[PDB]
Every structure is written in C-alpha cells, then in structure tokens.
C-alpha cells in the first residue's frame, strides 16, 4: 500500500506541489462523489490519491483538463 | 347561499366574487387557474378582477402562489353559516342539557349554623360568609395565625386554609386529626370531615391558637 | 493524559493547561520553528487557528469532521484580536487595511 | 481578505469615534445582586448586555423585542460577544504627557523640542516654569 | 395505530418551532386549533383536549423513545455544538 | 437558594443510584469505578435557556422543567478502588441528616 | 469572575482604572471649589502619576503595588517578556486533539509505525468514530453514539481499527532542538498506557528511555495528512539536515 | 471676596502640617498617601468655611472633626474593590471591636452566637456581614512554589451553550425528509430540485408568512360556539 | 510563504 512517497516525487519532481495535486484529487474523491481509477483495497483517500500519482495518470494537467471538461458539460448541458 | 355571503359582507361584493370567495375559502391556497376552471362562466380578467377586489379589500391574499382569506372574511363566512343555520338548518343549531353542578346539603346548612354559632361565640369575627362554587366560606377578617378562611366544601369535608401558618398551629390541628396541604408559597390546607363534633373541635383548637 | 475537546479559557479562547483541569498540550513556538523547517504549510495553519483559537473555525471544523468532511475555514486568531484591542487601548492607532 | 497593517498615532476625535460612551463612576457591581451599575466600569448601556439576550432591568428579553433598547434603562438586547470590542473613554480634565514619548530613551518630545530631559521633567512636575512666545 | 398520528404531531411541532414561531406551541387550545385547521385526524374527527391527553397518555415507553429519537434528528446542528463543549 | 445533598438527581440511571443510601452518600465498602457518583449534589438554577428536547417534552407531554442541575461529586476518570470511610462536617445551626 | 466560593477574581487593571478616574473626579471637584494652587498642583501631579502608572507601572522610580506587597501589572507588561501576549499566547498555543505519556521500546515494529495505547486512541478520535457510527447507522443521533462509546460496546473497536488504518499521527519531545523532533508515524493500537517507539529513533529525538514523556498530535484536515505523509513521515528523513550523514545509525 | 479667599489660603497653608500629622493613622488601609492628604485638604476647606474665632478656641480642635470626616468618608467610599455602603462598614468595625474584646476576654475564640448576644442583631444578619467582609484576588498571583503560572491560566469560561447562505443551507440540511413531506402534503411547499439559494430563502419566507397566515386564520375560530357540520355545509 | 504557501503567495501575489 503506502510506506514511501518516493514515486510521486519521481513522476512529479517538486515534492511541494504533491500535497496540492493529491489534496485536490482526494478532495474530489471524498466529498465529491466520484470514483477512483486504481482499484480499491479499503483505504483512505490519501493513499488512493497518492497511488494514482504513482500510476502517473493523475497530475495537475489532467485534473485541469477534466474540470475544464466538467464545467464544459455544465454550460454545454445547461441549454 | 351567496345571499348570506353578500348579506354578511354588508353588500360590498357581487355574486362573482361571492362564489369565487366560496372557492378560495373552500380549499386553502389553491391556484387561480382552478378558480377559473370552476368558473368557466367568468372571464380570465373577470376572475382576476374579482381577486382584484378581494386583494383590494385585503381579504384574500397570496402566499407566493397562495390564495386564502383572512380572519375577518372568515368571520363573514362563519356569520353566513350562522344565518344559514338560523334559516336553513334550525335544529342543527340546538343545545342539550347543562350541568349546574352541585347543590348544598341541609347538613351543610346546619353545620353552617353551628359553625357561625361557634365562630360568633368565640369572638373570631368574619370578613364575609360566602356561598362560592356552592361551598361555604367562613373567611377570617385578617390573616390571623397565618390563616385565611374556615371553609366548608359540600363533599363532606370542612377545611381550614391559610397563608404562612406556623408549624405548631398545624400540630394543634393534627391533634384533632386534620389533613394538610402546604403550597410553594405558604398556602396550607387542613381537611376534616364536616360534622358538629368536628365543628366544636376545630373551633376549640382555633380558639386556643 | 489525553483530550479530544475539553473546557476552554475565559480571557483568551484557548484550552486549559494540566491534567486535573482537563487540559490540552502546549505546542510551543520552538515546535513551530520545527514545522516551518519543513514545508508544512497547512499543518502549521490548522494547529494554531482551528485547533486553538478561532471559535467559528473550530465549530465548523467539528461539524464538518463529524459529517465526514475534512476541510478547514481558518479566519483569524482571536488572540490577535485581543492584542489588537489592547495596544489599540493606548494612544497607538493600528488598523486593518483593504 | 486584507493586506498590510496601518499604524499611526491616535487623534482625540479618532478615539472618541472608537468609544460607545463615557464611563463616569468608579463603582463596579451591585453587591446584593451581582448586576453591573449605571455608568461604572461595567455597564450595559455602555458596553452591552451582560447576560444571554437579557436586559438590565428585564423587560425586553422578548424575541419579538430583540434588538431594541428597553424603556426602564435602555439596553439594546444583542449578542454577548459584543462586550469584547466596545471600547470606552474618559475625559481627563487636564492634559497629560504620555509616558512612552517622554522616557523612551531617546525622548521623542526631548529631541523634538531640542531640550534636555531633566528640564522637561522640571516643567512637567510643576517645579520650574517655561515661556511661550516672549517676542519683544 | 395512533402512534403515526403522534408522529405527525411532533413533526408539525418540529417544523413549527424550527421556523422561529414558538409562542403557538406552549399555549394549548390555539395549538389544537392550528392542528385542526391544518387537518390532522385521529379516528375520522378533529382533536379534543381530552382526546389529546388520551393519545399522549395511551402510549408506550419504547414508542416514546422512538419519537424523541426521531425528533432529535432535525436538531442535530444544535446538539453537536451542545456536546462539543461538554466532552469532559 | 442553597445547594442540597439529596439522593434524588435528574436524568440518571438507577444503576448509578443503587450504590447510594437513601441519603445520597455511598455505603462504606462499595467498589467503585471511574464515572460513578459518590455524593449526590444538586444546584438550583432557573432561566436555563432550555434545549429542544425539553421544549418538546415540556410542551406536548405534560411535564414541568427542572429548576436545578447536577453537581454530584463523581469519581475521577480512570481510577477504581474501594470507599473505606466518609467524614461529614456540618455547620452549626443546621439540621442534620440520618447519616451524620 | 466569581470563582469557587465567595471569592472574586479580578485583574489589577480594574483597580488601576479605578484609581485614575477616581483621581480625575477629585481633580474636577477641586477645580469646582476654587482651591489654592498647592492643592490643584499636587492633584495634577497625582493624576499624571496615575496615568503613567497605568501605561507602564515600573518606568516610574517606584512601581506602585495594590496588595500582597507585589507590583501590579500595567498595560506595558501585558505584552513584553515571556509572559506577554507574544511569547505566550500567539506564538505558542495550547492545542486540542493531543496528549502525552511515557515511552518504551517494543522492537517488533517497522519504523514507519509506532505503538499507541488504546484508551488514548479512544479518547483523541471521538469525532471520527462519532462520524463513522453516524455513517454506518449503528447510532442515529449524536448522543446515542456518545452513550455507545462510553457504554463500550464491542463493535467500536473495529471502528477505530478503520479510522486508525492510514491516519498518521505526530510525535514530539518537549526540548525540540532541531527539526527531527516532530515526526509522523502510522499507529498500531496496543495495550497498556505507554507509547512504544522504534529503536532507531532514540538517537534522533535524543531520547533515553529513563522516563521521558512524549506528546502526540493529530492532523485533522486532508492537506495536513498529505503534509504528514509526504514530509513528516519517518522514512523520508533518514539523512541529517546538518550533513549527509544518516541518523538511523544503529546505536 | 478675593481678600477673604487669600486669607483662607493662608490658613490652609498654616494647617497642612496638621493634616500630615493626622494622616498617619490610615496608611495601610487600602489607599495611598496623596489620597489621604488631598482629602484632608478638602477637609480644611470645609473646616475654614465654618470656623468661629469668637469661641476662644484654638483651631486644631475644630479642624480635627472635619479632617476625620473627610478621611473616614473617603476610605468609606473608595477603599474596597466594590463600594459597599457606609453603615455596614460601621457594623463591621463594631464586630471587630467586639471580636477583639470578646476574643481575648473569652480567651478561646468568638462564636457568632456570642456576637448575637453582644450585638442585638438577630444573627441571620451577622453571617451576612461575615459573608461580605472579603476582597478579591488578582489573577497574576503566582501559584504555590512560584511556578510560572497564574490564576488567569486556570479560570474557565462557562457561558458556552445555546447559540445567510449556509443558514438557509443548514435548514435544508435540517429537514429529515418527513418535514418536507408534510410541507408538501399539508403546506404545499416543495423541496424538489437544487434551486437557486435565493429561491430557497424566498421559499422559506413563503413558509414563514405561510404559517403566519394559517395562524391568523387559526386564532379567529375561537369566537362562535358552533360545530363544524354547519361550517362544512358550504364546502 | 515557504512550503505550500509559497505557491499560494505566487498565486495571490500574481493576482495583484
Ligand atoms: Mg529524561
Ligand atoms: Zn433596558
């Protein structure tokens, strides 16, 4: 599960923005009713978000793309 | 019908807003589209004109979409059903038998005779003697020994009631076996059976307080 | 000795000190130096504002944290408002700007 | 929400604008009851209601009458936090030197007036008098 | 049974004192007039004071526990604040 | 008014009250745990600003409020032991209970 | 504030204001009676003395005392020193969700986890287990859940086996010299009343096991959990910040 | 006028030393020096205001009464943290006299009953006077063994009970869905969608004036002693 | 403005 966060620094090389990306993502998974991408092993949203960072399919850019797309579905599906 | 409405409103209305007023008071907070639905004879701005009269009179008003009368128009409706009961349902406006309730026994009369005999005897003057709830009240003049009145209930119990009586007086009346009920402000009840020997006993303990 | 949420002081809205009085732990300012030695921005924020001083912040924190939420609403420490009034109470006008 | 702190001296009209009244009397509490007094160091009609939406005399505890002053004593029934930010004042009948501008070392009044602090102390403590605009 | 009628009584009371309109609960006859005009009904009729004290009286302790537990559900934000300062 | 050392105390279970006597003081020898009650003390208090539970319970149910709240000497939390003796001191001119 | 008993508790500053407006009123009255100049002169002297005593009791040659032969505290010494507002109230505070105890060893642990006593973990995580008992619906109102955690049912221990599953805590020793004195750990619940601690850390805290007491703290918000797990976690800090030498040297 | 006033100035300047000489009797009584001195100056002012030289008396005797008047009045009204009135201060001083002689004459100690025989007051007032004979505590007093902690560190708050967008949002959160069920099955008001919060707040305003409206209908039926069967004849 | 707050003050300082 989670012993180190080294891979998150390997795929995002700043280590101070990781709390922002994983905070935004895990806030999108706990309060916002949306599913993760890595399958669940009955863990808190912290390990889920950081493990999505380890998979390299979540960063700041892709979250910007999908939130962009969500409000695009708001104003586009508003009619 | 609307005779009682327009008559009860002192002719401030016509028959259109009379039956519309029956509709508004008939179901609470109904839509005006239902009013125009149950009034197909009236136009849309005719119904809206009549609601302009009731809003103009302030009787029927909105609650958002709501439409209901106020209490004064409610009194007009209840007077309308009142006169409708006077002229249309006469025996519905009736009344059945009414309880008095309680009537003074002659034993209570004779025990009042010996009561006034022994209070008039022992120099204890009276404020007033009253038949109240059909019960006697040998009320003391002042609040003497923390006592207010020497009363008789018709339920076979003569009672001594007071305000901040001392404990030793209460002990003197539990010598002759009387119940007590203190209150949260000092009001004290003293129950004994209404009998001539209890008249002599209560007035002879009260005569030595 | 342990404490979730106990009694609070009177002049400054802070927890008490000790065990007999059901008190909290002093988080001294050398430990604050230890936190900003790290890049710990948020932990230092909530450990002097939400968990200590802002009454509205700690009520909203408690309600959100029993509602499954984890989110803070920091505002302002009340002790700074006390110091504001107290050095305001001399002939020294200080203010808050736009 | 807010940027930088602004800091200045206190104008007298500024600190009249801070206050919500003038304390007058040095007495504190009722003794028999523990109510505060009329215009002492603890007050309702200066500083606010001492109790939870409860008046000084006690008529307008009503929630319909909440927010209005009473008639026996005139107490605006409001929250209890309000007694942590309403400052007051007191009109000194004589001028008075602030101590921080007189003995800060260096004295601000001192080098502002180009005058030794022994001398200004002699002016303050009424034992040596000074001249204002002798002219000719 | 009558327990459901009592459920609407306390629920209307919950809305009633929730929306800052208090004085109409503590007085009783006007309160029963309010309940009769809004149209609650036990056994095909309106509500009498004798009938009110019967239906409050004829009642089971566990059902009373159920009613106050259901009543406390709307007033949760008050009670969390109420007990957060009493965790001694 | 003053305080009382009565045994009656609102809003508690009879399991707590089983350890007391009829006066409000535990018997000499009761094994106690943390959270139990030793001396039942009440404090009279009006103007309570009552909470919605007793708004409902006072209003709908025929029920008066409580002019008084708990101040009983409880066990400090965590400890457990045995009450081995109890002393009573009374101000002079005050009527005593049975236990003193 | 009236405290326990008849005793009242005041600040001396109340007395200090009382002196100055007392003296002010007497100066007003002495000007009203048209006194000679010695009287009003010394009256203005004492008013100046009272004002400057109120702003700084002690910059005068003799600081005045009110009672108990000990100088009272003016507005100046409410701020300065260690006992002022700055170094006591705003820069270092007393904080909820915390605790302390005595430490011990337990060498069966991996170094990213520490032992923790179960009565503390039941104490410091009351809002979490209240929220989970509301979530699973085993309780319905809040006070029912309070009665379930004081009544000590057997189901709650599972619940604080999920809320302490990946929720780190912070550990502290009071003389915090350098920044390896605040470290984060995943907890493991154990018995007893002491905090177990990994043996490769007793050099980092400068901790000997002769009875030292450590304080524990809880990160509440989510960003604090990420700051704890990314930066405060014990595996991330094996090298000193003073040099490249490791701190995890076996002692 | 000015002539008489400067004469009075000369007398006051003559008698300042008398004020200092009598001033030593009340030093550690809760005041300072200059309080007592300036109060004594007031006592000289009212003393010279009412002096008669024709009595053949030296001024000190007529002065001393007014000086003790001003001083005793002054400590009476200013000394304590709370200004208690003067006559129970006199009563307290009687109980300190009687406490002294009844103490060392009885040897052991005074009981309040012995004060209830030496003073004729009914001993319920005695324990009240004994209750109010106390003075408060400074919070900055150190704790025992001089540990750096004060009384203000320990006294706690008590008043911690029973306290717009989130205000309306909590009311929607306050409904446990039975409430809105009887708000639309009885009051017609609908919580259906995630509206504008202004539609929420205006909707709740319609609720408040709604129940006020049904209230205004509700109280008015307490007039006519009739049964509902004639009332439902028009329904 | 050191850890996360340095990015935060880049943001807020950038907005002004
Ligand atoms: Mg050691
Ligand atoms: Zn008022």
Please state whether beta strands G182-190 and G169-173 pair in parallel, antiparallel, or not at all (unpaired): antiparallel
CB-CB neighbours of G108 under 10 Å: 9
Place of tokens 């006697």: B136
Q: Which of E75, E76, E83, E84 to mutate to test the interface with C (most CBs of C within 10 A)?
A: E84
In our burial notation (b when 16+ CB lie closer than 10 A, e otherwise), range B8-44 reads bbeeebeebbbbbbbbbbeebbbebeebbebbeebee
d(CA F49, CA F55): 10
Q: Name all contacts of F8-13 with Cβ < 8 Å and 24+ positions apart.
A: F8/F40, F8/F42, F9/F37, F9/F40, F9/F42, F9/F70, F9/F72, F10/F66, F10/F68, F10/F69, F10/F70, F11/F70, F12/F37, F12/F70
Cβ of residue G94 closer than 8 Å to a chain H Cβ: no
Query: Nearest residue on chain C to G52, judged by CA atoms?
Result: C90
Number of folded domains in chain F? 1
Token digits of residue G201? 């850390």
Angle between helices A18-30 and A45-54 (to 10 degrees): 130
Other Cβ atoms less than 10 A from the Cβ of G222: the count is: 25
- Residue pair G251/G105 in contact (Cβ under 8 Å)? The answer is no
Structure tokens at D97: 């030197």
Tally of domains within chain A:
1
Asked if I4 reaches chain G (Cβ–Cβ under 8 Å), the answer is yes
- Contacts for G38 with CB less than 8 Å, ≥ 6 apart: H12, H13, H16
Tell me which residue of B77, B48, B43, B42 sits closest to B62, measured CA to CA. Answer: B48
Q: Rg of the Cα trace of chain I?
A: 7
User: D103 contacts in G (CB within 8 Å)?
Assistant: 59
The CA-CA-CA angle for residues D17, D20, D21, to 5°, reads 110
Ligand nearest to the CA of residue G103, numbered in listed order: 1
Nearest beta carbon to residue G166 from set A5, A30, A46: A46
Sequence-ordered list of residues with C-beta below 8 angstroms from that of F78, at least 6 positions apart, any chain = F34
**CATH number of the CATH domain containing A18:** 3.90.940.10
Q: Do chains D and A touch (3 or more CB pairs under 8 A)?
A: no
Rounded CA separation G12/G67 (Å)? 9
The boundaries of the domain holding residue A40 are 1-79
C92/chain A closest Cα distance in angstroms:
40
Q: How many CB atoms lie within 10 A of CB G196?
A: 20
Q: What are phi and psi of E36, to 5 degrees?
A: -75, -35
Locate all alpha helices (DSSP H) within chain H, ordered by sequence.
Answer: 2-23, 33-48, 59-78, 87-106, 112-118, 124-131, 165-174, 179-184, 197-219, 228-231
CATH numbers and ranges of domains, chain B: 1-98 (1.10.10.10), 99-209 (3.90.1150.20)
Question: What does chain D look like in DSSP terms, one character per residue?
Answer: ----EEEEE--HHHHHHH-S-B------B-SSS--BBSSSSSBHHHH--SBTTB-SSSS---STTTTS--SSS------SGGGGT---B---SS----STTTSSSS-HHHHHHT--HHHHHHHHTTSS---S----
Domain ranges across chain E: 1-88
Q: What is the C-alpha to C-alpha distance for residues B110 and A57, in angstroms, rounded to an integer?
A: 107
C69 is written with which tokens?
């939420």
Q: How many CB atoms lie within 10 A of CB F49?
A: 10
Rounded to an integer, what distance in angstroms lies between the CA atom of residue H24 and that of residue A31? 76
Which H or E run contains G158? helix G156-162
Under 8 Å CB pairs connecting chains B and H tally to 63
CA distance C58 to chain E (A): 10
Distance of CA G36 to the CA centre of its chain: 57
CB contact under 8 Å between G67 and H134, yes or no, is: no
Pick from C39, C42, C70: CB nearest A30: C70
Contact D110, D116 (CB under 8 A): yes
Whether there are 3 or more C-beta pairs closer than 8 Å between A and E is: no
Neighbours of chain A (3+ CB pairs under 8 A): C, G, I
Chain C, nearest residue to E81 by Cα: C59
- Exposed, middle or buried: residue G55 (CB in 10 Å: 0-12, 13-18, 19+)? middle
Domain span at residue F85? 1-100
Calculate the CA B174 to chain-centre distance: 36
Q: Name chain C's partners: 3 or more CB pairs within 8 A.
A: A, D, E, G, H, I
Across the interface, do G142 and E80 touch by the CB < 8 Å criterion?
A: yes
C-alpha of residue E26 to centroid of ligand 1, in Å: 64
- Name beta bridge partners: G233: G184
> For residue D69, how far is its CA from the centre of ligand 2 (angstroms)?
6
Q: Is G55:D98 a contact under the CB 8 Å cutoff? A: yes
Query: Could you tell me the two tokens for D104?
Result: 């800060």
Residue D34's alpha-carbon distances to E60, G2, G6, G94, G152, in angstroms, are 47, 10, 12, 32, 44
Task: Please give the residue of chain H at the shortest CA–CA distance from B75.
Answer: H220
How does DSSP classify residue G179? G
Cα torsion E10, E16, E19, E25 to 10°: value is -110
Nearest to C51 by CA among G219, A6, B79: G219
For residue C5, the CA-to-ligand 2 centroid distance in Å is 37
CA distance G84 to G90: 10
- The Cα–Cα gap between D83 and D87 comes to 9
* CATH architecture of the domain formed by E1-88: Orthogonal Bundle (1.10)
Q: Give the closest of G126, G141, G146 to E69, CB-based.
A: G141
Provide the residue count of chain F: 100
The structure was resolved experimentally with cryo-EM
Question: Between chain G and chain A, are at least 3 CB pairs below 8 A?
Answer: yes
For ligand 2, the distance from its centroid to the CA atom of residue D71, given in whole angstroms, is 6
State which residues have CB under 5 angstroms from ligand 2, the bound ion.
D 55, 70, 73, 75
8 Å CB contact between C57 and G63: no
H233 touches chain D (CB under 8 A): no
CATH number for the domain that contains residue F84: 2.40.50.150
Touching check for D131 and chain C: CB below 8 Å? no
C94 touches chain G (CB under 8 A): no
DSSP H192: -
Select from C8, C1, C56, C74 the least CA-distant residue to G98. Answer: C1
CB burial of E54-81 (b: ≥16 within 10 Å; e: otherwise) equals ebeeebeeeeeeebeebbbbbbbbbbbb
CB contact under 8 A, F55 and E17: yes
With H, G, I as helix, E, B as strand and everything else as coil, classify residue C95.
strand
G48: contact with D, CB 8 A cutoff: yes
- For ligand 1, the distance from its centroid to the CA atom of residue G210, given in whole angstroms, is 6
Tell me how close the Cα of I3 comes to any Cα of chain A, in angstroms.
7
Cβ atoms of residues E77 and H167 within 8 Å: no
Q: Which residues are paired to C96 by β-bridges?
A: D5
Resolution for this experimental structure (Å): 3.8
F49 contact H CB<8A = yes
CB-based contact, H10 to chain B, within 8 Å: no
How many angstroms is it from G247 CA to the middle of ligand 1?
20
- Out of C2, C50, C82, closest to residue G123 by CB: C2
G212 in a known ligand binding site: yes
């Amino acid at each position: 599960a989670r012993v180190t966060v080294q891979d998150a620094v390997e795929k995002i090389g700043n280590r101070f923005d990781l709390v922002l990306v994983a905070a935004r993502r895990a806030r999108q998974m706990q309060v916002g009713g949306k599913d993760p991408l890595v399958p669940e092993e009955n863990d808190k949203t912290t390990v889920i978000a950081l493990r999505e960072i380890e998979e390299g399919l979540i960063n700041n850019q892709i979250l910007d793309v999908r939130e962009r797309q969500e409000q695009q579905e708001q104003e586009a599906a508003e009619l | 019908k609307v005779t009682y409405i327009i008559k009860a409103s002192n002719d401030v209305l016509n028959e259109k807003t009379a039956t519309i007023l029956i509709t508004i008071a008939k179901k609470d907070f109904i839509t005006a589209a239902e009013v125009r639905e149950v009034h197909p004879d009236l136009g849309n701005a005719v119904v809206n004109s009549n609601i302009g009269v009731l809003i103009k009179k302030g009787l029927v008003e909105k609650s958002g979409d709501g439409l209901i009368i106020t209490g004064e128009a409610q009194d007009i409706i209840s007077n309308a059903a009142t006169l409708y009961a006077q002229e249309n349902a006469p025996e519905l406006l009736k009344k059945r038998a009414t309880r008095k309730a309680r009537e003074i026994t002659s034993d209570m009369e004779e025990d009042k005779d010996l009561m006034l005999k022994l209070l008039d005897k022992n120099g204890f003057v009276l404020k007033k003697v009253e038949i109240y709830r059909s019960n006697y009240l040998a009320i003391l003049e002042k609040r003497t020994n923390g006592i207010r009145n020497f009363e008789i209930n018709n339920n076979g119990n003569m009672r001594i009631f007071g305000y901040k009586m001392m404990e030793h007086h209460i002990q003197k009346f539990t010598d002759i076996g009387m119940s007590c009920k203190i209150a949260k402000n000092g009001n004290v009840y003293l129950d004994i059976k209404r009998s001539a020997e209890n008249i002599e006993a209560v007035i002879t303990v009260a005569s030595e307080l | 000795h342990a404490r979730s949420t106990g009694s609070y002081s009177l002049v400054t809205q802070q927890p008490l000190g000790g065990k007999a009085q059901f008190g909290g732990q002093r988080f001294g300012e050398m430990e604050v130096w230890a936190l900003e030695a790290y890049g710990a921005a948020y932990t230092l924020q909530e450990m002097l504002t939400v968990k200590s001083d802002d009454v509205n912040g700690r009520t909203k924190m408690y309600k959100n944290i029993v509602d499954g939420n984890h989110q803070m609403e920091p505002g302002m420490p009340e002790s700074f408002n006390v110091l504001l009034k107290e050095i305001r109470s001399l002939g020294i006008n200080i203010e808050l700007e736009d | 929400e807010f940027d930088a702190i602004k800091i200045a001296l206190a104008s007298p009209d500024m600190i009249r604008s801070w206050s919500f009244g003038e304390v007058k009397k040095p007495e504190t509490i009722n003794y028999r009851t523990f109510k505060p007094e009329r215009d002492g160091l603890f007050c309702a009609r200066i500083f606010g209601p001492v109790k939870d939406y409860e008046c000084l005399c006690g008529k307008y505890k009503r929630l319909k009458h909440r927010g209005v002053i009473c008639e026996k004593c005139g107490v605006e029934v409001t929250q209890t936090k309000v007694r942590r930010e309403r400052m007051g004042h007191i009109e000194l009948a004589s001028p008075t030197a602030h101590i921080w501008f007189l003995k800060s070392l260096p004295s601000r009044i001192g080098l502002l007036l180009d005058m030794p602090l022994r001398d200004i102390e002699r002016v303050l403590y009424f034992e040596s008098y000074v001249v204002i605009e002798g002219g000719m | 049974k009558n327990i459901d009628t009592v459920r609407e009584i306390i629920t209307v009371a919950s809305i009633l004192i929730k929306f800052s309109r208090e004085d109409i609960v503590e007085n009783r006859a006007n309160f029963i007039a309010f309940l009769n005009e809004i149209g609650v009904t036990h056994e095909g009729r309106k509500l009498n004071q004798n009938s009110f004290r019967k239906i409050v009286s004829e009642l089971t302790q566990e059902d009373k526990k159920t009613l106050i537990d259901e009543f406390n559900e709307g007033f949760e934000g008050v009670y969390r604040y109420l007990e957060m300062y009493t965790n001694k | 008014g003053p305080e009382e050392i009565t045994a009656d105390i609102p809003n508690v279970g009879e399991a707590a009250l089983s350890k007391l006597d009829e006066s409000g003081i535990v018997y000499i020898g009761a094994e106690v745990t943390g959270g139990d009650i030793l001396v039942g003390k009440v404090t009279p208090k009006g103007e309570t600003q009552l909470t919605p539970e007793e708004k409902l319970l006072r209003a709908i149910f025929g029920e008066k409020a409580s002019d008084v709240k708990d101040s009983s000497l409880r066990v400090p939390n965590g400890v457990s032991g045995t009450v081995i003796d109890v002393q009573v001191f009374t101000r002079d001119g005050v009527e005593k209970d049975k236990r003193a | 504030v009236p405290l326990d008993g008849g005793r009242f508790a005041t600040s001396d500053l109340n007395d200090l204001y009382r002196r100055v407006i007392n003296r002010n009123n007497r100066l007003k009255r002495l000007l009203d009676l048209a006194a000679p100049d010695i009287i009003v002169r010394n009256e203005k002297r004492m008013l100046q003395e009272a004002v400057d005593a109120l702003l700084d009791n002690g910059r005068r040659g003799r600081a005045i005392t009110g009672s108990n032969k000990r100088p009272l505290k003016s507005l100046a010494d409410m701020i300065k020193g260690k006992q002022g507002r700055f170094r006591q109230n705003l820069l270092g505070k007393r904080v909820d969700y915390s605790g302390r105890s005595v430490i011990t060893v337990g060498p069966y642990l991996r170094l990213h986890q520490c032992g923790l006593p179960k009565k503390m973990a039941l104490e410091l995580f009351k809002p979490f287990i209240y929220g989970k008992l509301e979530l699973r619906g085993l309780a319905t109102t809040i006070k029912a859940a309070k009665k379930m955690v004081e009544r000590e049912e057997a189901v709650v221990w599972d619940i604080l086996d999920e809320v302490i599953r990946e929720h780190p805590v912070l550990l502290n020793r009071a003389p915090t010299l350098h920044r390896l004195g605040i470290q984060a750990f995943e907890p493991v619940l154990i018995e007893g009343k002491a905090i177990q601690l990994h043996p490769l850390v007793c050099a980092a805290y400068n901790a000997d096991f002769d009875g030292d007491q450590m304080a524990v703290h809880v990160p509440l918000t989510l960003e604090a959990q990420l700051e704890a797990r990314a930066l405060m976690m014990s595996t991330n800090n094996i090298l000193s910040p003073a040099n490249g030498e490791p701190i995890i040297v076996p002692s | 006028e000015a002539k008489a006033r400067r004469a009075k100035k000369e007398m006051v300047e003559a008698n300042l030393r008398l004020v200092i000489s009598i001033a030593k009797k009340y030093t550690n009584r809760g005041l300072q020096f200059l309080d007592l001195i300036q109060e004594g100056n007031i006592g000289l002012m009212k003393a010279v205001d009412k002096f008669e030289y024709r009595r053949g008396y030296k001024f000190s005797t007529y002065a001393t009464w007014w000086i003790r008047q001003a001083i005793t009045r002054s400590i009476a009204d200013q000394a304590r943290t709370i200004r208690i009135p003067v006559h129970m201060i006199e009563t307290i001083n009687k109980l300190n006299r009687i406490s002294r002689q009844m103490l060392q004459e009885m040897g052991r100690e005074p009981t309040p009953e012995e004060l209830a025989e030496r003073m004729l007051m009914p001993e319920d007032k005695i324990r009240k006077v004994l209750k109010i004979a106390k003075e408060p505590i400074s919070m900055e007093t150190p704790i025992g063994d001089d540990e750096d902690s004060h009384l203000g560190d320990f006294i706690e708050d008590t008043t911690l009970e029973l306290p717009l967008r989130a205000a309306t949002h909590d009311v929607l959160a306050g409904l446990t869905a039975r409430e809105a069920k009887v708000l639309r099955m009885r009051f017609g008001i609908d919580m259906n969608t995630d509206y504008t919060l202004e539609e929420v707040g205006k909707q709740f305003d319609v609720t408040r004036e709604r129940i006020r409206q049904i209230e205004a209908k509700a109280l008015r039926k307490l007039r006519h002693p009739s049964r509902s069967e004639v009332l439902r004849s028009f329904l | 403005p050191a850890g996360t707050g340095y990015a935060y003050h880049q943001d807020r300082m950038r907005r002004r």
